[PDB]
Amino acid sequence: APLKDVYKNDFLIGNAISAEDLEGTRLELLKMHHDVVTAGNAMKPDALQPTKGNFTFTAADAMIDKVLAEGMKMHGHVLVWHQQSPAWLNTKKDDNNNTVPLGRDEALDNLRTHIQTVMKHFGNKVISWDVVNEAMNDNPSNPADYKASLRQTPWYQAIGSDYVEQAFLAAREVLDENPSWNIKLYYNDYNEDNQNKATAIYNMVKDINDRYAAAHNGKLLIDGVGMQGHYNINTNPDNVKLSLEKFISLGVEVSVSELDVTAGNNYTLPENLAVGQAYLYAQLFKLYKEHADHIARVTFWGMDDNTSWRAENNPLLFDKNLQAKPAYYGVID
Numbered sequence: 001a002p003l004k005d006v007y008k009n010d011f012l013i014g015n016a017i018s019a020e021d022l023e024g025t026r027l028e029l030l031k032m033h034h035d036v037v038t039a040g041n042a043m044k045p046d047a048l049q050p051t052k053g054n055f056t057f058t059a060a061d062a063m064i065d066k067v068l069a070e071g072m073k074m075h076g077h078v079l080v081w082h083q084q085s086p087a088w089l090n091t092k093k094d095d096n097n098n099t100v101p102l103g104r105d106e107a108l109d110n111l112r113t114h115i116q117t118v119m120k121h122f123g124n125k126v127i128s129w130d131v132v133n134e135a136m137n138d139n140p141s142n143p144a145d146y147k148a149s150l151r152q153t154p155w156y157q158a159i160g161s162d163y164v165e166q167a168f169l170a171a172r173e174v175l176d177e178n179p180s181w182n183i184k185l186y187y188n189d190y191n192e193d194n195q196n197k198a199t200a201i202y203n204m205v206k207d208i209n210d211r212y213a214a215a216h217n218g219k220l221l222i223d224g225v226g227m228q229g230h231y232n233i234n235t236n237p238d239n240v241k242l243s244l245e246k247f248i249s250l251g252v253e254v255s256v257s258e259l260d261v262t263a264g265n266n267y268t269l270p271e272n273l274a275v276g277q278a279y280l281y282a283q284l285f286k287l288y289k290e291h292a293d294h295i296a297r298v299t300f301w302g303m304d305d306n307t308s309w310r311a312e313n314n315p316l317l318f319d320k321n322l323q324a325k326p327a328y329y330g331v332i333d
């Protein structure tokens with residue numbers, strides 16, 4: 001059954017692509033099963049503004065035009081991150097040639113110009129953007145203080161603990177100026193089943209959205225939280241459920257943005273763990289169907305195990321020959 005038909009009334013079904021997925025049998029498989037795609041790499045900061053003022057949209061524009069011509073939607077990923085992001089945005093070389101943070105004013109100017117120029121370039125060719133990715137430390141010991149729980153990344157070091165909020169405000173201004181665009185703004189992160197990290201992300205989004213809503217008649221600044229769903233055979237779906245509930249209580253939409261389930265290593269998937277992997281996918285989709293009114297999209301991070309970013313750990317619904325694994329039957333249910 002095509003995945004997007006099974007879940008047609010529940011959430012968009014997504015995948016995560018490179019230029020390889022837009023031709024041949026892979027394109028057919030992609031179109032048959034998914035309503036939406038995320039660029040695995042082509043819309044990251046390193047790909048779109050590799051040096052200051054040098055915006056490079058040609059490959060990303062070809063990808064998005066082909067995705068749309070082929071009947072699918074595009075989720076935009078990602079405007080602000082501490083990986084795949086050029087050092088010029090938030091650092092410089094001191095005299096003694098050490099890498100040090102830029103000052104707040106200059107980093108804020110780079111942050112805003114990146115977000116605004118990229119969003120204005122694509123316009124409403126995307127349905128959503130991951131504005132800020134992975135800003136939270138793992139297993140934070142004091143999630144009551146979100147700011148102290150933030151990863152001290154290059155953006156934090158140049159701008160300060162308010163940079164996640166400044167990123168969203170810059171994105172929100174573009175949508176205020178282009179009111180006909182329908183684009184949801186998301187904050188995206190992983191290990192969101194760790195109850196400490198989920199509390200810290202909840203506290204961040206709550207503080208930022210409460211202050212915005214008080215000033216703007218109840219409007220959301222952060223529209224969405226992306227649970228990346230980089231899960232493993234020991235992931236406890238009860239902790240997923242607690243986290244999904246917590247985020248829903250913000251009044252945001254949720255997406256499961258980069259779903260995969262590592263099982264095995266060294267490219268070897270034992271038969272009993274193919275069955276364990278299928279069983280956990282089936283438990284997760286049972287959970288997602290139960291919360292479908294608050295879940296906009298569930299995206300798998302890749303098509304098949306040999307082309308996963310974690311290929312060694314056999315994470316996905318199809319094998320290297322594009323043949324359905326037990327996982328696939330677990331999802332279709």
Ligand SMILES: CO[C@H]1[C@H](O)[C@@H](O)[C@@H](O[C@H]2[C@H](O[C@@H]3CO[C@@H](O[C@@H]4CO[C@H](O)[C@H](O)[C@H]4O)[C@H](O)[C@H]3O)OC[C@@H](O)[C@@H]2O)O[C@@H]1C(=O)O
Pocket residue numbers: 040041133190228258309
């Ligand atoms: C051991 O070094 C390895 C890198 O650290 C590892 O990430 C990988 O780098 C590649 C790059 O691969 C993409 C990495 O991003 C993946 O997607 C991200 C997953 O992390 C978050 O959850 C993000 O939100 C999500 O965007 C992509 O799926 C991977 O394709 O691809 C460009 C390549 O030039 C880098 O080297 O591999 C490194 C390695 O040495 O193997």
Ligand SMILES: [Cl-]
Pocket residue numbers: 023024025026
């Ligand atoms: Cl092919």
Ligand SMILES: [Cl-]
Pocket residue numbers: none
């Ligand atoms: Cl073509």
Ligand SMILES: [Cl-]
Pocket residue numbers: 177178179180181
């Ligand atoms: Cl408009």
Ligand SMILES: [Mg+2]
Pocket residue numbers: 017018019039040041042043
């Ligand atoms: Mg890509």
